[PDB]
Amino acid sequence: LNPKIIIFEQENFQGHSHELSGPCPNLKETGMEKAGSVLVQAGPWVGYEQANCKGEQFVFEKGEYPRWDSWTSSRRTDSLSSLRPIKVD
Amino acid sequence: LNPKIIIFEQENFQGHSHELSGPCPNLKETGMEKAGSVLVQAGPWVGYEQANCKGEQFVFEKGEYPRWDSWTSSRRTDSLSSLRPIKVD
Numbered sequence A, B: 001l002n003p004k005i006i007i008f009e010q011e012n013f014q015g016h017s018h019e020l021s022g023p024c025p026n027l028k029e030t031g032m033e034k035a036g037s038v039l040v041q042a043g044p045w046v047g048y049e050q051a052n053c054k055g056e057q058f059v060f061e062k063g064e065y066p067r068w069d070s071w072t073s074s075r076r077t078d079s080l081s082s083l084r085p086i087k088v089d
Helices: none
Strands: A004-010 A014-020 A037-042 A045-050 A054-060 A063-065 A082-085 B004-010 B014-020 B037-042 B045-050 B054-060 B063-065 B082-085
Touching: A054 B054
Parallel strands: none
Antiparallel strands: A004 A014, A004 A037, A037 A063, A045 A054, A045 A082, B004 B014, B004 B037, B037 B063, B045 B054, B045 B082
């Protein structure tokens, strides 16, 4: 329907924000320096460690993710370089 | 509404199968020795490397995943220990 996702550069939803409503192969194009926290208004979305949907995957469901360890439990990285709405059904 | 996913003991949908329609914290409880391939009838789902939905995530959407390199575009590991439907809306 209307997928809406917002990335804040610092944890706890602080700093500059970047909104998406569709796929983004390279988050750097939004000016995002780094992913600090995520707000999902409408999802679900799948984020990727690297650009163009590569590397570790992370699921973003409607709700809040105030810190990197809120969206990953693999303990690998807080890197988030690409995002896309997840195909429903 | 009605999630449905099937895990095959081997790739190309060969060998024993194990059907799920809801969260499963430990795939070995279905008798699955290994996740050779995956078939998603109604998704999306998210699989985890470790039990109890912990560790690296892998998104499975409606469609077919014939081999261990169809969901984890990296030969990091083949282990799949838990799965759950992804929350919609």
